[PDB]
DNA sequence: GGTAGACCTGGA
DNA sequence: CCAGGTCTAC
């Protein structure tokens, strides 16, 4: 009982709750949907993972979000739950965002009704950078497996629940270390093992370390996007993922073949400027402008919602 | 200078 | 053998 992953109904004295309606958030729609890859539904409706350098389990009812942290056991403190608030960017009201997109997009109107609770996670820049560098020519199941082994290999050991040992995401110096590539290739990352290693070294040995990456949150989206592309293994898509998911740039719209199919089938979209009939540097850039023009400042979040509905 | 092909490797 | 992302040879 005092062992393994906890459940709201088996260790109540250790569960604090954050007032949150299921319309404002649906863990089952945001946690395993390709944003973060370190969340596991260890037990039904219960999600465990590393947040703010600690292991947590989250489960929700209808008006509450129940949280328990694994650091002397005791329910989460005020400051701790506040961290969870920040991670789920709760001050950002979805009821308001859905109303807006819906009123300017009749297609979002219908489709979005059945998929409330989809928001964007405010992740850490490094985790995003390397997680998303691994996303190349890949899928969520495979990315998750890769990222899981990468953290098992180079991440600080946090704690152990049942037969699961949690690790923090690797630091920059860890990934920049000698022979990390050879080691990551043994973990099946393929050519992605090269980009991880190079970007780790590039940031530390050319860009001015961690702080460089951080400062991008205070930079403009167009400025932050251009910065990230410098890094080896980081293209336009990954740059937009990092901008949208870790650099507080909600108007960033990562364009990929998926978004393309949603554009042609749901909006009869066609490229205007670019002469390429299909995806290309020009056309994808154009597609991104289309949705930012369509949904506005949060075109990135709108996309998330549409991607889920398309699942 | 916009556009094929390789990069890893698991499915085709 | 080649994606579906990035990087590079014409
Ligand atoms: Ca690049
Ligand atoms: Ca339609």
Quote the distance between the C-alpha of residue A268 and its chain's center.
29
Q: Report the C-alpha gap between A300 and A304 in whole angstroms.
A: 7
How far does residue A48's CA lie from ligand 1's centre (Å)? Answer: 33
| C-alpha to C-alpha distance for A78 and A83, rounded to whole angstroms | 9
Domain with residue A275: its CATH number is 1.10.1670.10
Q: Taking the C1' atom of C2, which residue's CA lies nearest?
A: A137
| A118 within domain boundaries | no
Resolved by: X-ray
The question of whether A114 is a catalytic residue gets the answer no
A152/C4 CA-to-C1' distance in Å: 28
Query: Are A36 and A105 contacting, i.e. CB atoms less than 8 angstroms apart?
Result: no
Interface residues, strand C, Cβ cutoff 7 Å: A 135-138, 191, 195, 229, 231-239, 256-258
- Model resolution, angstroms: 2.6
Q: Specify the DSSP class assigned to residue A13.
A: G
User: In whole angstroms, what is the distance from residue A30 CA to residue A45 CA?
Assistant: 13
- Compute the distance between CA of residue A78 and CA of residue A16 in angstroms, rounded to an integer: 9
Q: Is A132 found in the same domain as A239?
A: yes
CB-count burial class (<10 Å; 0-12, 13-18, 19+) for A161? middle
Q: Is residue A117 part of a domain?
A: no
Is there a single domain that holds both residue A292 and residue A209? no
In a domain, A157, yes or no: yes
Nucleotides of B under 7 A from a protein CB: 2-3, 7-10
Domain co-membership, A144 together with A108: no
Instruction: Please tell me the distance from the alpha carbon of residue A81 to that of residue A284, in angstroms, as a whole number.
Output: 39
- The reply to whether A213 and A268 lie within a common domain is no
Question: Is residue A35 a contact partner of residue A245, using CB atoms and an 8 Å limit?
Answer: yes
A158 shares a domain with A79: no
Contact (CB, 8 A) for A27 and A308? no
Question: Is the Cβ–Cβ distance between A170 and A201 less than 8 Å?
Answer: no
Residues A214 and A241 both lie in one domain: yes
Do A169 and A133 form a contact (C-beta atoms < 8 A)?
Answer: no
- As for how many domains chain A has, the answer is 3
Same domain, A292 and A270: yes
Cβ atoms of A70 and A56 within 8 Å: the answer is yes
Domain containing residue A169? 124-249
Kindly identify the ligand whose nearest atom is closest to the C-alpha of A195. 1
Query: Of all helices (H) and strands (E), which one includes residue A43?
Result: strand A40-43
What are the backbone dihedrals phi and psi of residue A16, each rounded to the nearest 5 degrees, phi first? -100, 165
* Ramachandran area for residue A45 (φ above 0: left; ψ -120 to 50: alpha; else beta): left
Q: A21: domain CATH number? A: 3.30.310.40
Measured CA to CA, the distance from residue A213 to residue A237 in angstroms comes to 17
- Rounded to the nearest angstrom, the distance between the alpha carbon of A266 and the centre of ligand 2 is 5
Are residues A107 and A217 part of one domain?
no
Alpha-carbon distance of A105 to A23, in angstroms, equals 20
Rg (CA), chain A: 20
| Closest nt to residue A284, judged CA to C1' | C5
Q: Which ligand is nearest to the CA of A242?
A: 1
Nucleotide nearest the Cα atom of A274 (by C1'): B2
Q: Same structural domain for residues A80 and A134?
A: no
Measured distance CA(A88)–CA(A51) in Å, rounded: 11
DSSP tag of A297: T
């Amino acid at each position: 009982s005092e062992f393994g992953h906890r459940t709201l109904a088996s260790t109540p004295a250790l569960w604090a709750s954050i007032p949150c309606p299921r319309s404002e958030l649906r863990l089952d729609l945001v946690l395993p949907s390709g944003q973060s890859f370190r969340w596991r539904e260890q037990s039904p409706a219960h999600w465990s993972g590393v947040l703010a350098d600690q292991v947590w389990t989250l489960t929700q009812t209808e008006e509450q979000l129940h949280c328990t942290v694994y650091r002397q056991a005791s329910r989460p403190t005020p400051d701790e739950l506040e961290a969870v608030r920040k991670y789920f960017q709760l001050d950002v009201t979805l009821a308001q965002l859905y109303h807006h997109w819906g009123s300017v997009d009749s297609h979002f109107q219908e489709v979005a009704q059945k998929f409330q609770g989809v928001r964007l996670l405010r992740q850490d820049p490094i985790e995003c950078l390397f997680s998303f560098i691994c996303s190349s020519c890949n899928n969520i199941a495979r990315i998750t497996g890769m990222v899981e082994r990468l953290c098992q290999a180079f991440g600080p050991r946090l704690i152990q629940l049942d037969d699961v040992t949690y690790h923090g995401f690797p630091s920059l110096q860890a990934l920049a270390g000698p022979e990390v590539e050879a080691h990551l290739r043994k973990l099946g990352l393929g050519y992605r093992a090269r980009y991880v290693s190079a970007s780790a070294r590039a940031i530390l040995e050319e860009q001015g370390g961690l702080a460089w990456l951080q400062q991008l949150r205070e930079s403009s989206y167009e400025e932050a996007h251009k910065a990230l592309c410098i890094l080896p293994g980081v293209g336009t898509k990954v740059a937009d993922c990092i901008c949208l998911m870790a650099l507080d740039k909600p108007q960033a719209v990562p364009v990929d073949v998926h978004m393309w199919h949603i554009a042609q089938r749901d909006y009869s979209w066609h490229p205007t400027t670019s002469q390429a009939k299909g995806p290309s540097p020009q056309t994808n850039k154009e597609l991104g402008n289309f949705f930012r023009s369509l949904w506005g400042p949060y075109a990135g979040w709108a996309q998330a919602v549409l991607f889920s509905a398309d699942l």
